[PDB]
Design a protein around this motif. Structure first.
Motif, short mmCIF file in Angstrom:
data_model
loop_
_atom_site.label_atom_id
_atom_site.label_comp_id
_atom_site.label_asym_id
_atom_site.label_seq_id
_atom_site.Cartn_x
_atom_site.Cartn_y
_atom_site.Cartn_z
N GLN A 143 2.53 5.85 5.73
CA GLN A 143 3.41 5.83 4.55
C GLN A 143 4.20 7.12 4.41
O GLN A 143 3.94 8.12 5.09
CB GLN A 143 2.61 5.60 3.26
N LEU A 159 -1.17 -4.85 -6.20
CA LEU A 159 -1.79 -3.53 -6.42
C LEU A 159 -2.41 -3.52 -7.80
O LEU A 159 -3.55 -3.13 -8.00
CB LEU A 159 -0.74 -2.39 -6.36
N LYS A 204 3.56 -4.56 -5.54
CA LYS A 204 3.11 -3.97 -6.80
C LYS A 204 2.30 -4.94 -7.65
O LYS A 204 1.39 -4.55 -8.38
CB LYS A 204 4.29 -3.42 -7.60
N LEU A 227 5.23 -2.42 -0.38
CA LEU A 227 4.26 -2.55 -1.44
C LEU A 227 4.43 -3.83 -2.27
O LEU A 227 5.55 -4.23 -2.57
CB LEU A 227 4.30 -1.31 -2.35
N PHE A 252 0.70 -4.94 0.77
CA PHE A 252 2.10 -5.02 1.15
C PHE A 252 2.50 -6.48 1.12
O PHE A 252 1.65 -7.37 1.04
CB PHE A 252 2.32 -4.48 2.56
N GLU A 268 6.40 6.79 -0.99
CA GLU A 268 5.60 5.57 -1.04
C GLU A 268 4.27 5.88 -1.68
O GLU A 268 3.88 5.23 -2.66
CB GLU A 268 5.44 4.98 0.35
N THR A 319 -3.76 -0.61 -0.24
CA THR A 319 -2.44 -0.81 -0.82
C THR A 319 -1.89 -2.10 -0.23
O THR A 319 -1.72 -2.20 0.97
CB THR A 319 -1.46 0.38 -0.56
N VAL A 333 2.63 4.53 -5.20
CA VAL A 333 1.32 3.91 -5.34
C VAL A 333 0.58 4.72 -6.41
O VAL A 333 0.01 4.14 -7.33
CB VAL A 333 0.52 3.95 -4.01
#
Lengths: 291, 292, 291, 292
Positions: free
Chosen positions: A51, A24, A21, A19, A13, A55, A11, A59
């Motif tokens: 996490q 991701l 996104k 995060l 960051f 969170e 994941t 994800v």
């Protein structure tokens, strides 16, 4: 239909350790394009234990939007708390994952019945989704016997085992006992041998950067060409030797960053950053992996 | 040269728990006849640690009389004492053994430097016979790192490593680092996986009763037949499953007794005899192996 | 000042497994009347790792309200996440706790530098609250070395050490290295022996039902009456033998229930109930202790 | 009558690694003159596992002579082999030792029953000398449970337990379970804490150079003087800190050599010699202990 080579997704960051996104999604797609069979989200690799539920739920939702339908999706729902895991199991079902997974609850010492009941509850909340018992004694501190492994594996609703143990005698005993079980080799370092022992697939974090090699090993062994299978495994181990030096999660992220997938290759503290000295070999590996 | 499938020879005793020279001789020949590449004599499997230097030498002398020139013979020469191992190392040379071997000294915690000097001293006394470093963390309790292993494995005089460990990642790192090193897989249960990882042969106890299967798994992997390779390993694993319940040495001796090789299948005290309940399975095992 | 016998607080849950404030407050005061030197709240014994941050804070505030000023207050503030820990540290400060505390971040293997920086980050957030380093290898899976413990114990901010180790050779080595360190003996089964080796106090979970015994041993060793000290320690071990048998947290909650302190002697799942076969034993235990 | 503070005797060797009988006797008398309650011979400290049976018998025989019922004598007779252990047990009686002892057989994993039969046979050979079960998980790698310790401890012939374990909860439980059991604390580093927990004495290697300190902790606790009990323990620990740094056996022999007790401060290989850098500390240590 859960058999395969699945990347244990990281994941990404941002600089604020929140995060990313954008990265991701960029990662879900990167993995898809490299021929992976599916994704295992929210596992150890995903820094799940560093996490919060929300969170992890976040994800979960984002990768489902990104990959539901395209590949097989498995959600790691494991928390030390049963109630917490069920919540995640519940969201996984709701987001549309194909299966659910959970580490053996750790830190507090639990009896085996407590372990079975813990899986039962999660299986229940998963609402139909097959469960993938996740066995990793090195990090969980939970040392299950073969019988216990057989008992869990035969619990109703359980559809697979993620074997992160380099004990390949146990890998085959498990296979001899359960010929139809989906068994994933958890240690990348020994993938080829794991398969030869009885594994019919794998879930590993180094796949994120080089899943095609693992799939290559699957084909090679399938075609009786152990010569190239071995070659692939050492190539994979040369990488693992390096990542273990630089730190695995952060090293993968640095490579992925040089591959233009991850913006900020940071892990969440306690983890520190990669030692700058490792940066050149990583940059190098990224470029070379572009094969 | 030393590569291959070597059986870790058992030592047959009588009702008096003294060596059974006749059965020992039968065992060497049975192994030879079964197509083994060589014999690892006086190791853990030979019950070395529960017999004396003389008792140990006597065994080396007898199997040399029987096997020398017909197959490779590696003499496990280690003791906790460097002095005792040097003496045994000297005899293995005298008897005409091809190589020498020694576990990492146990009970007392020795430094790595002390472990290296132990090997140098023994190699010195081997006067030419190559040393096979014997790594069995599970029994010796000596947990060596890969660096220490690389150092030991490169000590002048060391020809091979007997890796008795299930860490197949280490098995391949060792190979990646010593592409020419003779690497023996120590755990029979993972023989096929250990070879795929980088081992180029093996030394083990179960080879005494079904050694041809191991030779089989070796050829299959060579001819890219992972099906019979895996098939062979699972058939070895069901035997190993039983022996692990019954006791391996005593279990293997018991089967050997049924194959008419060993007179008395007893191990030395503190080992107790096999539980009578297990005999039906052992006889049956002896039958099928005899048939195949 | 932080020296002393400190009870590790249990968190009373209701039938629905939610915080039982009625029982919490009751347990706080119960512990106070026992003549305990203070309370170590939110630790292993408080089921911290099966609660959420908010839940942990809630518990933090209620005991602060109940005992702030009356007795010494140390907030176990640790998680695997440095950020989660800091947040709870920041809250411990706000609620007016006397010190902060944290287990070495578990599950993921962290470098010693990582561990040190982690304590540093939490110390920063404790805004002046001294840090009590929590060494519990059995559960954390982290085995520091003396030099490592020495570094930790000397970090700027660290005020004491909770040594949950039965290594009483290392206990005297720690006291020898640091003559002025607040050293808490973490295993109740060896309390008396821990103190003779160097600990100047202790933090135990069993202190909740018989804290006076622990203060009893202390006084006896001080007065040079090791005979009574020993007699007191064997008494505590008979109790401890049973609790380990029935399950420590659950067993303790059950005794306190029969002691009309806690309403429902439940721990949160994955933990399970006390087997019924032990209730007459635990019942008889509550009777003798209150007698 | 076996209860007390007894030194785990070291066995002096010459420059060529052979027993130094003169220094053995010199070491016996020194320990005696140090007011130790008795001696434990042939144990881990005595480098037994690096000796041969007859070598161990020789040592036993020379100290029995020197020891002339002046002090309590306990013979560590254990080997992995029951038969070897028996012979040694039978020699110990022959020499007139007061008791016999034995570690849990190591290297090969054995069952609890095999361990129970083992002790019995030895006990059987001791011919009246009680058995001091010797428990040292750290070295033997044998993890006995309290219930297993209880069974052994109640086994006919067993008269004492040598607890070389740092678990003081288990020490408390054993004493609880056996109010009249001779419980010897095995780790000198926690002698004071082990006594408080229930050990009624101790058997240790460092007793060779400062046995009076352990006799002092014993007296201090008796008179409820915990203040001096602790000073004595930290003084002993400062010493052990050093010995662990240098190598316990060798450091001891080195101090004893400086005290003109032991002629050659050597351990049989694979134990190497003491680092030259530590001599200044051992030289000074031999001085203050002497001065003391």
């Amino acid at each position: 239909n859960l058999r395969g080579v699945m990347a244990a997704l990281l994941t990404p960051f941002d600089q604020q350790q929140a995060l990313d996104k954008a990265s991701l999604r960029r990662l879900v797609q990167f993995n898809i394009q490299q021929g992976i069979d599916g994704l295992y989200v929210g596992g150890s690799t995903g820094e799940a234990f560093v996490q919060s539920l929300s969170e992890r739920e976040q994800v979960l939702e984002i990768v489902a939007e990104e990959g539901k339908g395209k590949i097989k999706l498995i959600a790691h729902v494991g928390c030390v708390t049963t109630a917490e895991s069920q919540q995640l199991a519940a969201s996984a079902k709701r987001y549309g994952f194909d299966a659910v997974s959970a580490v053996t609850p750790f830190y507090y010492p639990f009896s085996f019945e407590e372990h079975c009941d813990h899986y039962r509850a999660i299986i229940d909340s998963a609402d139909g989704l097959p469960m993938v018992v996740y066995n990793i004694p090195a990090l969980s501190g939970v040392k299950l016997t073969l019988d216990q492994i057989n008992t869990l594996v035969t619990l109703p609703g359980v559809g697979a085992l993620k074997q992160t143990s380099g004990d390949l005698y146990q890998m085959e005993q498990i296979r001899r006992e359960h010929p139809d079980l989906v068994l994933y080799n958890g240690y990348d370092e020994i993938f080829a041998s794991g398969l030869l022992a009885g594994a019919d697939g794998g879930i590993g974090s180094t796949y994120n950067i080089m899943g095609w090699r693992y799939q290559g090993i699957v084909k090679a062994l399938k075609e009786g060409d152990i010569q190239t299978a071995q070659k692939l495994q050492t190539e994979c181990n040369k990488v693992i030797d390096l990542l273990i030096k630089t730190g695995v999660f952060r090293g993968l992220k640095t490579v992925l960053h040089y591959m233009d997938v991850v913006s900020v290759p940071l892990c969440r503290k306690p983890f520190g950053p990669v030692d700058e000295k490792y940066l050149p070999e990583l940059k190098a590996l990224a470029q070379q992996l572009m094969q």
